Amino acid sequence: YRNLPFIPTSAMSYDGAWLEELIEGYQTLAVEGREMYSLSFETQDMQVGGVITNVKYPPRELTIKYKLEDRDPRVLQEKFDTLKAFLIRQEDVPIIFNDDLEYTFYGRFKTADNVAGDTNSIISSFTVLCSDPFKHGKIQSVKNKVIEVLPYPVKPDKLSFKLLTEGLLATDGNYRLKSSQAKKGDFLEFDFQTGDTFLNGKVNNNLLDLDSDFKNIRLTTGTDFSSSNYELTIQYRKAVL
C-alpha cells in the first residue's frame, strides 16, 4: 500500500510548505476570517446624525482549525514540537490557501487556543495575524498606465522611469512626483516602493527625489501617467480584501 499525505480543500501553505505534509496526522479543517472583512470607524456625533472623522483598515487575523492525531503519546508531543518550531516566526511569512491559490497573504503566527492533554487525537485552532489585511495576486509589469480592473487602490512595488526631456514631473491628476535637476538624456530611475530609490545602477537616496515629491502614490483602475517626457514601467500586485 502507499502512505500518501492528504491535502484538504482549504489547506494552508505557511512559508511555501504545507503543514499537513510536514507533520503526519495534521489536517486543516477550516479557515475563518478571509471571506469577510470589518472596518474601523472614527465618528464625531452631533445633534442630528454624526459625521465620519476617519476610516481605518484594521490588521486581520485568520483563525485556522486543525486536527493532529497519533497513536503514540511520545511521538504526538514531538509532532507538536515540530509544529510550534515551524509556526513561531520572527518575521512575516507568505500564506497561500488550497482553495484560493491565486492570492498570497503575508502574516505571522499569533496565538493558539487551549489544547487538551488526553485522547491522542486533538482538535484545536490557532490564529495567524496579518499585518497587511490585503491578499496580493501575481506581480505585473505594465507600461505607463494601469487599465486592469483594480478592486482596491494599490500601492506599487517598483516604478522604472526613463527620461527623454530636461526634468521629471510624473502626474496622474491627483499625485505629482517631482525631480528637479534630474539625469536628462535617457537615464533610468528606479523607485522601489518596498525599500529605497536608485539612479541608473547605483543607490541614490539623498538626491533622487525633490522635497515636494510623492512616495505614497496609489493606483486606481484608471490611473494614467503616460507622457512624452518619460517612459514609465509600473510594477504592482493586485490587492484584495
Partner: protein, 299 residues
C-alpha cells in the same frame, strides 16, 4: 499570443502553489514561460531535454502525458512551452510539472524534475456538449460528419455521372456519336460567340473596344434586398467571349447563346451599359467612346 510566467523550484516544497489557467479552444497561443530555480539560484539543465509532464485526471497510465519543450535556454534555466491540442484536451483540474532528462538511447541516465503546479483548463463553446436533433453533440463531431457528407456526396455524384455515361457511351457503337454531339453543342452554346447579338450605338467615328462580363447577385440586384444573396457584392464574374462587328457609330457584339438575357437596359453616364433581369446582370464596357443607345439585334 498570451504568456504565463512561473518561477518553478526543485528544492522548495511547494507541491500545489503556483497557478496556471487556460481554456479548451486556444490553439498555439497560450504559452508557459518558466524559470527553473534550485536552492535560490537558477538551474542549468545543459545537456538535458526539457519535457512537459501532465498528470491528467481519468487518463492515467505509464505515459500519462509527456511533450518535449522546443523553446528553451539551458544556460539561464528558462523555457517556453506552448500548450498543444493534447494539453488542452483534458478539461478540468489537472497537475503538471517539467522533467529534464539526459537520455542516451532507450535507457535514461539523469532525470530531474520541478515541483508540481496546478494546470487547470476551463471549458469552451467547442468542449461543451450541445443538444442538436434530440441528440447530444460536440462541434468537432458534427464538423467531421458534415465534411464526410460533402466528400462522400461528391464521390457518389462523380460516379453517378460516370456510370450513366458508359451506359449510353461505351455500350453503343453509334451512342458515342450522340454523347459527343451534346458536349460539342454545349461548348458552342457557352464558349463560342453564337446565338446572341447586341447593338451598341456610339459617338465615335472609329471602332471602340467592347468588353463583356456576366455576373449574378450583384450590388442591389438580389431577390430579398441588399446583402440577401449568398455572395455579397456579386457572385462569379464570367468574361463573355465576344465577336465584334462594326458599322458607322454602331457596334454589333456577338455572344454565346447561353449569355442570352432579355431584361432592362440601363445606360450609365460614360462608356458603360447594363442589361439586368432580376439577379442576372450583363455588363458592357466600352473604351474611347460614349454609348448613346443599346438594344438586342433584330432582323
Amino acid at each position: 499570443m498570451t504568456e504565463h510566467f512561473i518561477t518553478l523550484s526543485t528544492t522548495e516544497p511547494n507541491n500545489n502553489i503556483g497557478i496556471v489557467k487556460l481554456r479548451h479552444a486556444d490553439v498555439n497561443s497560450q504559452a508557459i514561460v518558466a524559470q527553473i530555480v534550485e536552492n535560490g539560484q537558477p538551474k542549468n539543465f545543459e545537456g538535458l531535454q526539457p519535457f512537459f509532464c501532465l498528470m491528467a485526471q481519468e487518463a492515467t497510465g505509464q505515459g500519462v502525458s509527456e511533450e518535449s519543450v522546443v523553446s528553451f535556454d539551458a544556460k539561464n534555466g528558462t523555457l517556453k512551452y506552448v500548450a498543444s491540442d493534447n494539453a488542452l484536451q483534458f478539461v478540468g483540474r489537472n497537475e503538471a510539472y517539467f522533467s529534464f532528462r539526459k537520455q542516451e538511447g532507450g535507457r535514461w541516465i539523469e532525470q530531474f524534475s520541478t515541483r508540481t503546479f496546478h494546470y487547470i483548463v476551463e471549458k469552451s463553446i467547442y468542449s461543451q456538449p450541445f443538444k442538436d436533433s434530440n441528440y447530444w453533440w460536440t462541434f468537432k463531431e458534427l464538423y467531421r460528419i458534415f465534411n464526410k457528407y460533402i466528400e462522400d456526396g461528391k464521390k457518389s455524384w462523380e460516379q453517378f455521372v460516370e456510370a450513366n455515361r458508359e451506359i449510353l457511351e461505351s455500350i453503343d457503337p453509334g451512342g458515342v456519336l450522340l454523347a459527343k454531339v451534346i458536349d460539342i453543342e454545349k461548348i458552342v452554346n457557352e464558349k463560342v460567340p453564337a446565338g446572341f447579338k447586341f447593338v451598341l450605338e456610339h459617338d465615335s467615328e472609329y471602332q471602340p473596344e467592347v468588353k463583356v462580363t456576366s455576373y449574378k447577385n450583384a450590388i442591389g440586384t438580389e431577390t430579398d434586398g441588399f446583402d440577401s444573396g449568398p455572395v455579397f457584392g456579386g457572385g462569379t464574374i464570367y468574361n463573355v467571349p465576344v465577336s465584334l462587328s462594326y458599322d458607322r457609330q454602331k457596334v454589333y457584339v456577338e455572344m454565346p447563346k447561353s449569355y442570352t438575357l432579355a431584361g432592362d437596359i440601363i445606360l450609365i453616364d460614360d462608356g458603360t451599359l447594363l442589361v439586368i433581369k432580376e439577379t442576372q446582370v450583363l455588363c458592357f464596357k466600352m473604351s474611347d467612346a460614349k454609348i448613346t443607345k443599346g438594344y438586342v439585334f433584330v432582323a
